Structures are given as C-alpha cells and as structure tokens.
C-alpha cells in the first residue's frame, strides 16, 4: 500500500497526507444456472422434415412452446444450405431463452431468394412478405431441387404478384379477389382492367440457379414479453445462499447474494426492478420462491502514510465497511 | 459548508462485467480527472470550517 500510492498518483515518491487509492474487489465463487425440468424435446423436426408445405402468401404458423430445444442440427452439424441470423448471435442460441416461436414455411426460387431481409424492395418484399426492424430470429434455407422439382414444372405451389398497396408483415393473404385497376367489374374472371395476381413457380432441375427451389424456414423469437420456457440443453445446479456468486436466472445474468424476500409478490411475476431499473428480485424457475439480489464489492480503500524520506509505515482506512465480517 | 460526495467509475459505469473494465481503459484518464476534482472540493470544504 506504500506502492499503491505510487501507482495511482504516477509519481516516484510519496508526499505526506491522505490519498484515496482503490475499491474492494470480491471474486465470485460458483455459478448458478436455473432452468425448469422438462422431459419433452421441441418438435423442430416436424416443421423441417414434413412432406407437404404451404405457399408464400399463406403459410403454416406452428407455435412451439414449453419444451427443451435442440440446436445441434442448426449449429454444429450442417445439413442445410445457409445459416442467416440478424439480431441473435448463432453461437449464443443455446444460451438465451425465449417464450415461444413462430415458424414460417415457404418456398421461394433462387432468383427471388435474396429479398428476404428487413427493409427490402421487391415483388415478394412489398406485396407478399416483409420483416420489421425490431424482428428477432434467424433464416434457415435448404436446397430442395433433388426432391420437389419436376421436368415439366411443378405448378402446385403458388405465389401472388399483385396487391393494391403494401402489405403489413406477419399477415397472410387468403383473398381470391381479382385485382381491379379500372371501373370495369371483373365478375371473378380476368378481362379489361382486371389482372390475375396468382402465378405458379418455374421449378425445373435442368436450368440454373434461379430455377432451383429453396425451402426457407424463418423463426421468430419473442424476448422478455413473458416467462421463457424454451432454450437449449443447459444444466441445473443448487441454489447458494449468503455468498457472492454469478447468476444465470432464465437467461438473465448478474452477480449478488440471494436473500429471502419478506414482501407480498405476484404469482405471475418473473422479476422486478429497483429505482435504477436493474433486477433486485427474481422468482425461482423450478419452485415458487422469490430471492432478493444484494450486490457485492462496495467501499473504498484509503491509505495514510508519511513520505519516503520519513517512514514506510502505512495506515489503511476502510471507509463505510464494517470490519467484523472481514486488494491482494 | 456543504455535502462532500465521492463517485466511483467502477460500480457506476460497469455492471460488474469483464468487457466494461477492458473498454474503460481505452478512454483513459477521464475518470482520473473526476476523482481529483471531487478530492479538491473535499479539501476546501474542510478549510471552510
């Protein structure tokens, strides 16, 4: 602590007086990861491996919740053509936890497959499928041209070119209504001032990249709108009380001391916030208990010494911290 | 005299993470100026008494 005076002041010698040096550092011991016990894996193979799919104008939205996810086919193993994520880190998929997911299954040809991104402009990117700027999820594509193609072409899958205005995202168009430019009524069929928006895909194996069909499944993640029951295979440890430790509580991380809450709380409450809007209290995921969070490493270090021409003895002042409980 | 306060940059800016303490050193002596300014207030508040 004589040389802690020389380190903070950036000087070779010591002047006589009292100098503020540093603060306490309390190292955490263990790490606590809490996730509830669910023996059911998530049905990710039902949306990927199914025989018949839907179109780009009307898709099949599969709500998947209250399970344990398997990300090893989407991260370590690569059966699939490309991995495109935007707001989520692909390595951190197994770390973070979300409530539910909405899978959108649609087949887009390889010329038009570059229009799937937030904030694009195109035929699919205006009148069919959009993404918002706050969208959270990933885009997974795979080449289907050895299976779903046909020599004469596959007209069973369909798409719609035309719409009167720009379509809002997360909305399916089920309307069979003929697009009417003028004042002539269509009466269900094409004609003068009546165009038919519904088209069929170009899919053949013999042609190039733009005729190759791709199976695109886009996942939509919902973060902190609800309690989070869905993430990867993370383990679980015991709760440690009266110790400064690292926290992982349902994806939320921190450092503190777990103490018992004496107040009356909501049964649906996941966590709660202080005057600074940080989490001071959180419900346990497996059993119903709410434990408070009291942070560690508080108080300063002040030294009192004579200078280098007098004596090397250093008196150390701990400010604000009781020394009955208790720098290298 | 008035109330003598001292503000640490470790607990206030950082949420006890290792990335925040590593990127604080790229800004350098900005918190060296603030701790010497609050020290020089607290010397002169004892000279007022």
């Amino acid at each position: 602590p004589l040389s802690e005076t020389k380190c903070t002041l950036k000087s070779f010698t010591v002047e006589k007086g009292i100098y503020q040096t540093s603060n306490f550092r309390v190292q955490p011991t263990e790490s606590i990861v809490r996730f509830p016990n669910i023996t059911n894996l998530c049905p990710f193979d039902e949306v990927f491996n199914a025989t018949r799919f839907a179109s780009v104008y009307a898709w099949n939205r599969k709500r998947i919740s209250n399970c344990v996810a398997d990300y090893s086919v989407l991260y370590n193993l690569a059966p699939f053509f490309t991995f495109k994520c935007y707001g989520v880190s692909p390595t951190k998929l197994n770390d973070l936890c979300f409530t539910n997911v909405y899978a959108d299954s649609f087949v887009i040809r390889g010329d038009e497959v570059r229009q799937i991104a937030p904030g694009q402009t195109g035929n699919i990117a205006d009148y069919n499928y959009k993404l918002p700027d706050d969208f959270t999820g990933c885009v997974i594509a795979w080449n289907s041209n050895k299976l779903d193609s046909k020599v004469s072409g596959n007209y069973n899958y369909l798409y719609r070119l035309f719409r009167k205005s720009n379509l809002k995202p997360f909305e399916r168009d089920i309307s069979t209504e003929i697009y009417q430019a003028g004042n002539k009524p269509c009466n269900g069929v094409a004609g003068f001032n009546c165009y038919f928006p519904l088209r069929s895909y170009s899919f053949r194996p013999t042609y190039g990249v733009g005729h190759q069909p791709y199976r695109v499944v886009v996942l939509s993640f919902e973060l902190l709108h609800a309690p989070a029951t869905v993430c990867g295979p993370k383990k679980s440890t015991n709760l440690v009380k009266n110790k400064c430790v690292n926290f992982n509580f349902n994806g939320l991380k921190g450092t503190g001391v777990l103490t018992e809450s004496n107040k009356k709380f909501l049964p649906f409450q996941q966590f709660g916030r202080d005057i600074a809007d940080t989490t001071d209290a959180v419900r346990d995921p497996q059993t119903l208990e709410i434990l408070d969070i009291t942070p560690c490493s508080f108080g300063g270090v002040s030294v009192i010494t004579p200078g280098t021409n007098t004596s090397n003895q250093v008196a150390v002042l701990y400010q604000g911290v009781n020394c009955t409980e208790v720098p290298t | 005299s008035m109330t003598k306060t001292s503000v640490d940059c470790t607990m206030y800016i950082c949420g006890d993470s290792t990335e925040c303490s590593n990127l604080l050193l790229q800004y350098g002596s900005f918190c060296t100026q603030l701790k010497r300014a609050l020290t020089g207030i607290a010397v002169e508040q004892d000279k007022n008494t």
């Binding site: 009291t294 508080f298 | 503000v7 640490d8 940059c9 607990m11 206030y12 004892d46 008494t49």
Partner: peptide
C-alpha cells in the same frame, strides 16, 4: 434534515465540536 458506488464523505469537524468553538 447507494449500491451503485455512491459514497458520502463524512465531515472532519463534528457538530458537537462546532458548538465547542461557538
């Protein structure tokens, strides 16, 4: 007439000793 690292420095001259000079 807190946990974020905000420390209130105590005064050197206590209010009992201010009245001793008074």
């Amino acid at each position: 007439t807190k946990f974020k690292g905000l420390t209130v420095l105590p005064p050197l001259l206590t209010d009992e000793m201010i009245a001793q000079y008074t």
